[PDB]
Design a protein around this nucleic acid. Sequence first.
DNA 1: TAATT
DNA 2: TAATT
DNA 3: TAATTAAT
DNA 4: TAATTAAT
Lengths: 64, 68
Amino acid sequence: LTRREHDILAFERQWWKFAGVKEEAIKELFSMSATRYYQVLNALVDRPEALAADPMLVKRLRRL
Amino acid sequence: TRREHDILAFERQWWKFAGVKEEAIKELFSMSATRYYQVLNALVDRPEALAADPMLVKRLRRLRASRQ
DNA sequence: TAATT
DNA sequence: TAATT
DNA sequence: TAATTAAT
DNA sequence: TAATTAAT
């Protein structure tokens, strides 16, 4: 289906631009490079206050 | 520790975006996300997929070849 | 770039 | 330590 | 003593 | 398109 494959290419194309918004947001919200954010992120997941402050978040993230 | 605070809300709101992405998947192609990801790996590695966009497929192969 | 200096 | 690397 | 993607 | 021990 080409009339539906054309839709599929756009759908993932936009959701790519959103992670870019996250990258821009992280840079302008924390004055940090976008990946050092993720370096300490998985470390703080394995801390009891992280699983107490927001359970579903750390649950999904630790699941990786 | 207030940086830790707003980071939690940040990933929380972008977790909701992932949730919005899941619902967008379920109501645009009538497809569960699991089979959606079961075919995504079978389509990105195609000659036509690489041809349409040079950066998209390259990022997809590079990042998963580094995470795994 | 990214903890490490 | 503290911008600078 | 339950849960959950994921496997087969 | 569901099932099921079994894994983590």
